[PDB]
Design a binder for this molecule. Structure first.
Ligand SMILES: Nc1ncnc2c1ncn2[C@@H]1O[C@H](COP(=O)(O)OP(=O)(O)OP(O)(O)=S)[C@@H](O)[C@H]1O
Ligand SMILES: Nc1ncnc2c1ncn2[C@@H]1O[C@H](COP(=O)(O)OP(=O)(O)OP(O)(O)=S)[C@@H](O)[C@H]1O
Ligand SMILES: [Mg+2]
Ligand SMILES: [Mg+2]
Lengths: 452, 452
């Protein structure tokens, strides 16, 4: 009804991700009656749009065993699009792909220990030879070579984000092996799926921020000026910074983060200048989001603030808020856990004149949050998260994250007999049997707290 | 149950330290059925792991009079491993010891007064000649030469921390005699055994700090993010700083101390820069512990703080806390006796989101504390510490330390007839008879105080 901005919306090209029968990294499969509909011939380079900004460029081929409303893609493409099997993706015609002449690829450290020989010769040359492969910047692809398979990241391309790897292309692979930990931080960058119990608030954010930015026509046509300052407020640990991360990763807009304490940490004037820089940067990068996390740090009530520099910074901000003309296409978001400690002038019409209440999650909220927190956890057959959701009345998402963390530590405490701190590494078998039982959660629950 | 992380755990190589029959510094003895089990042949150079980070390298030989679950080692090796007889040690196969070509050894000043002659010629050369001795950097070893025995410290070695002293090795011994007081300060560096009444809290510290740092595989495998800010709190003199010292000396992690007043003593900006430096240093030295002692000095409630520089520092800290990415492998520890006077933003999720309560000790705690405080004290036959533990309900560790100090001063007061302040030194006999009686404790007890 109001949640309408979030509805899936059936389209010709919106397709469910199915497992590939064509196991090659550069290839996606569609049914023959689906290829006809989208006017995609055999062998055409296509653009795929996954979750959290992520894209892949692939060749499209027909498949009989594939369904009409499905798309067949292997683990590697699915990984690049940040999608599990049975997620919706956009398939888009992509005939504008120039042949690249310089690509920079790097291996991943843990997939490359022992005998270098020559990485390009053993792995990359047979992977690209006459293949005319489409690849995007930031693609992590796997290659097999005798003994084992090595993962590579596309660090740099010749045309801007994507190119066809012709026999012309110089494939540079000199450099530092990409640390596995970097790409784990990248896979586990926060998106809208990582934020739970905030469905109606997320709808609000897309309405107030995403919609006026990526569709300013609506507002101009309907004769209405889009709101330009959105303040997220709520109790400690409710998801504001998480939403800030999710928005940063999921928007079409250029995004600029300002941390409250980050600003206040810097020298007198050198902080006013960083604020100035942020607003000018956002203005410069046409459609933009400025997120001021912990706004209360930078904009407290000009009465209850003793320092002149501090009083000056509130004035510096207000000026910038009012400084953005209509045709700037910059929405400013901010987050606080003490909204009533922000100078009221900032909360007036034209400034942060819209509020999103990221409040305490209900029983259904808590369930969502526990499901998001355990998606990477090994859980036992007997673990009932609905039971946990129900036993946690006072809990915000931060409390639940901590709750899941403690139940896991308890599962570790149970496995302390076969583990010792003095050992160099932990026994192989011991690591696999690690499952967080319901009994672990009941311990975590017994120890649990609200921020009371 | 929860104390599980601390449990000794029986292992093939975990062995009880027994007095040596082979009196040589380079040699440890095991029983024949123990040598078979660990696949250690006669003469093999081994790696021994004691308490408080300490190691020793020795040659292993069979012994008949030695038990299976016991290891025979002399006073010197026991000293180097910082163990008294009947402590558990790790013995490790060590076939990777290259012959050293330069060692720097220095004598200890109090074992070297009068006639130098030549230290290398009289002591070192007969000690190492054709002996193929394993030695570690920091080893304090004793050598006998005619008139008396001299103590030597291994200051520097040729391969990194340990080498075999072949006839190739240049034995440098030029330089300042090592001060005895330095090596007393090193022997009496604080460890986990020096902290009593904190068993469950010590378990917590190893869980939250040692375990994630020296075994981050578990947390990744279980799909759980390790906590990254641990705050120890409790009343004045409970043993927070002591724990900080113990952790500093006992961890495998790099350890950076920050004292609160230390920081706030330094010029405006020059303190922000010192905080900066501490975090960059920890980040640089891969797996690290930052200890912020007396946090309340640097992070008070941004409201109840008048100084702009002081307000700026809290902001500088928060920034750094949030600034460490997941792949940093840096846990920040902090201590305070006023946890409620710290800015709550610091005590939020992701910051100091974990609390260790170093509280008042129970009866059994006080007994532990008194046993630690009197381990170097001359006590009378009639001194019953269980009696002292029970008479001290209000007392924390600092109170008990002072109680032991006052009991000792009372023993000195009883000996005031044969002592005079005007004398150049105290009579020899008078010094030896100095024993602290139970009557001394009852005087100390009578005068005693909590911090009420
Ligand atoms: N609604 C939620 N859904 C999923 N995870 C959540 C939610 N709320 C909190 N979490 C988890 O708790 C952590 C902390 O939440 P944050 O977004 O940092 O808190 P916050 O709302 O910014 O609170 P303040 O005001 O900074 S204390 C996140 O990293 C998530 O892992
Ligand atoms: N739990 C303990 N076990 C053994 N000795 C202790 C213990 N607590 C205190 N002590 C002794 O008392 C002295 C003072 O303790 P500290 O660790 O400095 O106190 P603290 O807990 O840091 O208190 P604050 O907050 O600085 S007043 C130490 O040097 C120890 O000798
Ligand atoms: Mg936040
Ligand atoms: Mg202290």
């Amino acid at each position: 009804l109001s949640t309408a901005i979030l509805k899936q919306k059936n389209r010709p090209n919106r397709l469910i991700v199915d497992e590939a029968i064509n196991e090659d990294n550069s290839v996606v499969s569609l049914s023959q009656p689906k290829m006809d509909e989208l006017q995609l011939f055999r062998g055409d380079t296509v653009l795929l749009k996954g979750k959290k900004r992520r894209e892949a460029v692939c060749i499209v081929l027909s498949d009989d065993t594939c369904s009409d409303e499905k798309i067949r893609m292997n683990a590697v493409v699915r990984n690049n699009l940040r999608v599990r099997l049975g997620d919706v993706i956009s398939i888009q015609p992509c005939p504008d792909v120039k042949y690249g002449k310089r690509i920079h690829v790097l291996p991943i450290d843990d997939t490359v220990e022992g005998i270098t020989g020559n990485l390009f010769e053993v792995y990359l040359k047979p992977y690209f030879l006459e293949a005319y492969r489409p690849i995007r910047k930031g693609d992590i692809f796997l290659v097999r070579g005798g003994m084992r398979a090595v993962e590579f990241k596309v660090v740099e391309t010749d045309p801007s984000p994507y190119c066809i790897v012709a026999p012309d292309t110089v494939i540079h692979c000199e450099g530092e092996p990409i640390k596995r930990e970097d790409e784990e931080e990248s896979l586990n960058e926060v998106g809208y799926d990582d934020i739970g119990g905030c469905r109606k608030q997320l709808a609000q954010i897309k309405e107030m921020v995403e919609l006026p930015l990526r569709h300013p026509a609506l507002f101009k046509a309907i004769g209405v000026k889009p709101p330009r300052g959105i303040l997220l407020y709520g109790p400690p640990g409710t998801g504001k910074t998480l939403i800030a991360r999710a928005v940063a990763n999921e928007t079409g807009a250029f995004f600029f983060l300002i941390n409250g304490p980050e600003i206040m940490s810097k020298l007198a004037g050198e902080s006013e200048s960083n604020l100035r820089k942020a607003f000018e940067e956002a203005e410069k990068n046409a459609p933009a989001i400025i997120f001021i996390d912990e706004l209360d740090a930078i904009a407290p009530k000009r009465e209850k603030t003793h320092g002149e520099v501090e009083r000056r910074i509130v004035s510096q901000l207000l000026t910038l808020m009012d400084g953005l003309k209509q045709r700037a296409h910059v929405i400013v978001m901010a987050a606080t856990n003490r909204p009533n400690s922000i100078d009221p002038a900032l909360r007036r019409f034209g400034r942060f004149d819209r509020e999103v209440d990221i409040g305490i999650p209900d029983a259904t909220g808590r369930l969502e949050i526990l499901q998001i927190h355990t998606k990477n956890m090994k859980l036992a057959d007997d673990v009932d998260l609905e039971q946990v959701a129900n036993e946690t009345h006072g809990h915000v998402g931060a409390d639940l994250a901590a709750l899941c963390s403690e139940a896991a530590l308890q599962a570790i405490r149970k496995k302390m007999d076969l583990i010792d701190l003095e050992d160099e590494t932990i026994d192989a078998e011991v690591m696999n049997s690690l499952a967080v039982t319901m009994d672990d959660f009941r311990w975590a629950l017994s120890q649990s707290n609200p921020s009371a």
